[PDB]
Symmetry: C2
Subunit: 118 residues, 2 copies
């Protein structure tokens, strides 16, 4: 089936934005999971995508903006951004986040680190 495992790795993070590196961990028929490695002082500009985006902060500290809201996000915090909802972020510290997209975000399939897929 669409079953897959993936092992953690410290390499193969593809650049996306200045200070923002991305890697697709796993994906299936309905979801796609990425891991965002973001550097202190960097920033995600405002963008909208036709994919629901639900996330979890593994480490670090960021400021997550959604619509009019502005919230400081630290390790263990989570968020769910519906499709086409404006969102951006300021990266205050070296942070890592796990973000799952739905439906399967076809564009990010190519970022999969196939060296770690079991």
């Amino acid at each position: 089936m669409a079953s897959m495992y993936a092992k953690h790795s410290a390499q193969n993070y593809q650049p996306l934005l200045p200070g923002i590196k991305i890697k697709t961990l796993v994906y299936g028929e309905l979801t796609l999971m990425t891991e965002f490695v973001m550097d202190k002082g960097s920033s995600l500009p405002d963008h909208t995508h036709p994919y629901e985006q639900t996330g979890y902060l593994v480490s670090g500290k960021i400021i997550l903006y959604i619509e009019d809201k502005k919230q400081q996000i630290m390790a263990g915090d989570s968020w769910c951004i519906p499709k086409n909802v404006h969102h951006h972020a300021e990266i205050l510290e070296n942070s890592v986040a796990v973000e799952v997209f739905a439906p399967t975000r076809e564009e990010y399939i190519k970022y999969l680190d196939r060296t770690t897929v079991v």
Copy 2:
């Protein structure tokens, strides 16, 4: 329909012996849950009509999907398609974040509303 959620060390609700659960956030297509799992516990074999993609925040487990068996450490990830048999053995005090698609309605009742903004 957007929402943030802050981390809180409580309101992790009973699910199974040694398995506590908390729904962090949920949307129109996804639902995120966090499983706190005690060393030596086990999830029994089950199937649900929801795709289950997960990330191991900490610990060490043994995840079974169909014939496959893999030892899962922190930073590892998996994806279990809908109605696929799966279970796990817990080797250490572990934490996993799991997202379900479509939004798993019967898990909305585990949402820790005290930390949702």
